[PDB]
A and B are shown apart, each in its own frame.
Chain A
Amino acid sequence: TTYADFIASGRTGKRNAI
């Protein structure tokens, strides 16, 4: 699913600025 794809992205935690 789209949710499953989000988990697989590995970017589910807190995101830093570039």
Chain B
Amino acid sequence: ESVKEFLAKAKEEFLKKWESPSQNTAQLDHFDRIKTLGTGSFGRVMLVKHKETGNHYAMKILDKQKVVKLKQIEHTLNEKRILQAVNFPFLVKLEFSFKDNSNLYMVMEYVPGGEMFSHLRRIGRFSEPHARFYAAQIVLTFEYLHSLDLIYRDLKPENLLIDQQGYIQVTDFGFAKRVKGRTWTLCGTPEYLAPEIILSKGYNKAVDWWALGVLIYEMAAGYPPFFADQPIQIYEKIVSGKVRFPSHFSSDLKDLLRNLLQVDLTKRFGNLKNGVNDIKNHKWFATTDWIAIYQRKVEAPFIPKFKGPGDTSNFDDYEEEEIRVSINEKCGKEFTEF
């Protein structure tokens, strides 16, 4: 009932900021570029330094013309609207945003530990305590997002950054949707798609709890529960609802996963009468202090190597391309609300 009051306050704050988003809170020549941290079909993310303060940030730069070309207008505007409106310990903070003739810019706190993905593939797999530490943060994050009627829809280790204290930061919301009932879009990453998405059903927030099962499985095993050479063959396995577990999985872990990786929506944990508490109260989470996780007081099992501010060792190396700003304004009408 402290959770009830907390979430109602959180929803009132979200909705005020959703209805009146912030705009145009810095400009490009306030920053020096340091390094490209990631590329993509219509954008890049760069490590930048704010000239006045010397603070480092991650700057996402989206080429408006490419956004239009790849049909990503709504997704791009939606991500920025979400980021400036949410507030939760495991969601990245949007510090500034602005646009010019060519690009949209979102400036976020720099998360120096990189994607969980790299750490998982390097180490092979996480122990169950290590996996549980990360899983608890996702459970709280989905409890928050779902209470705002936001379905996340692209959970995966790639989308989970690790901060300097070893805790998770979610940065991408390009597929999230505010949807109190059902929605229908085929979207996500093949390994993480819930069966009802593959089967072209109307679906709801229960897809996020299925994806948590896939994440917990892949963290604890080192590989996801359903894989194949091609996505079409991944989908056949997913909808079969046949899963095999490594022999080192505990009984508690297998029981939780049978209940998350549940094809039948009337039986999937997270979607039942008791909602999220079926997950929080499950034996695999018995040792979890949910409040201490929220308060970031639990000692993290893994701390990324960080040699100071602006260390980029946990990201891959990319070819540095120019940041061109056209003499002509591109796509002004499409992006007015950014």
Contact = CB atoms under 8 A, between A and B. Distances in A.
B158 A2 contact: no
A1 to B, nearest CB: 10
Nearest to A15: B189
Describe B's contact surface by its main secondary structure.
loop
B229 A9 contact: yes
Contacts of B272: none
Contacts of A2: 223, 244, 246
Nearest to A9: B227
A17 B117 CA distance: 15
A17 B188 CA distance: 5
B222 A18 contact: no
A12 B222 CA distance: 10
B244 A9 contact: no
Nearest to A5: B227
B290 interface: no
Given A9-B229, A17-B154, 16 more contacts: A2-B223, A5-B227, A6-B223, A11-B227, A11-B228, A11-B229, A14-B117, A15-B158, A15-B189, A15-B190, A15-B191, A16-B189, A17-B175, A17-B187, A18-B187, A18-B189
Interface of B: 117, 121, 154, 156, 158, 175, 186-191, 222-223, 227-229, 231, 244, 246
Q: Which 9 A-B pairs have the closest CB atoms?
A: A6-B223, A9-B227, A15-B189, A17-B189, A9-B229, A14-B158, A6-B227, A11-B227, A17-B154
